[PDB]
Design a protein around this ligand. Structure first.
Ligand SMILES: [Cl-]
Ligand SMILES: [Cl-]
Ligand code: NA
Ligand code: NA
Length: 322
């Protein structure tokens, strides 16, 4: 189409030392961007499969994105199934049509990074609603239970999101719970995927009174949105999910069941994170998104996250594929 043109960029962002995912060292974050133009209209997307979580590799995503772009340029925008590519391409399309609103709040649940005191100091005097995120299942269960307990004790109105990524056996999950004072358990907003199996996670929720959330379950073939005793939320990671339309359908299905839906990071670059902030403000206006992952990186690119002190690279500094 005479009116259409596109650009594709490839990049690698250095990570801070000490970032681990499913027994892996994420030394750099590797990804792609697409920039679509149709007349005076422009739209961007991020295509960044996450090692150990995405089925597709960076290299596979690159090929799929390029071939999708080739078709789009010729007037065919049907999206591929590959989730990171479907997500990025769909965001670019949504930006071209103005469907993705410009607005964002740019606030996220702060992520604990090994210093609960700092987290306490940061939240203890924050006016309004206090929500934070603690990763669990990396250290031994006793440690996690004590940390969670101390934080809840330190700030009486703090609500914690906990993320286990299916780390625990039923025994370890019970060991974690025993260190959390029952008087404080109601202030665990949710514990994402405590156990290795979903049935064990549900049993844990019912036994302990600690609310749970689904995250990786949503990407399993069998997944059905269900209201269930103990289940309070779902975590939706668009890069691992697919198109913006699919993300919308999932948010809607969760809300229709009274479940909280959290728009969440797959460690995207700043560009993708700002888009997730817009998606969250639009589709989940009442729910703080899980986007506090930028500080794990050494640079921003193209669009900065407001308030980040990290340097921001311009597009001219990235490797251009198309
Ligand atoms: Cl290549
Ligand atoms: Cl730029
Ligand atoms: Na636009
Ligand atoms: Na999670």
């Amino acid at each position: 189409n005479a009116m259409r043109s596109a650009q594709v960029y490839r990049w690698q962002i250095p990570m801070d030392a000490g970032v681990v995912l499913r027994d892996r060292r994420l030394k750099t974050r590797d990804g792609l961007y697409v920039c679509l133009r149709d007349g005076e209209r422009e739209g961007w997307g991020e295509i960044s499969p996450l090692p150990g979580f995405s089925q597709e590799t960076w290299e596979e995503a690159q090929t799929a994105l390029l071939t999708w772009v080739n078709d789009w340029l010729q007037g065919s925008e049907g999206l591929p199934e590959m989730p990171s590519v479907a997500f990025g391409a769909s965001c670019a399309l949504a930006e071209l049509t103005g469907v993705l609103p410009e607005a964002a709040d740019y606030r996220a649940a702060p992520l604990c990074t090994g210093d609960p005191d700092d987290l306490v100091l940061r939240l203890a005097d924050m006016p309004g609603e206090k929500i934070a995120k603690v990763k669990v299942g990396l250290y031994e269960a006793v440690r996690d239970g004590m940390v969670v307990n101390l934080l809840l004790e330190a700030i009486p109105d703090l609500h914690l999101r906990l993320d286990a990524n299916r780390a625990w056996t039923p025994l370890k999950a019970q060991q974690f719970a025993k260190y959390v004072n029952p008087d404080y358990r109601a202030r665990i907003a949710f514990l994402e995927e405590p156990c290795k199996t979903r049935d064990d996670s549900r049993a844990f929720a019912r036994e302990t009174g600690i609310a749970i959330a689904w995250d990786e379950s949503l990407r399993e073939a069998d997944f059905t949105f269900e209201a269930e005793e103990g289940v309070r939320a779902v975590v939706i990671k668009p890069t691992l999910t697919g198109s913006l339309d699919k993300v919308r359908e999932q948010v809607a299905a969760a809300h229709a069941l009274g479940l909280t839906a959290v728009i969440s990071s797959s460690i995207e670059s700043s560009l993708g994170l700002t888009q997730l902030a817009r998606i969250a403000a639009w589709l989940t206006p009442g729910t703080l998104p899980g986007l506090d992952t930028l500080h794990l990186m050494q640079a921003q690119q193209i669009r900065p996250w407001p308030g980040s002190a990290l340097p921001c690279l311009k597009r001219e500094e990235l490797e251009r594929l198309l």
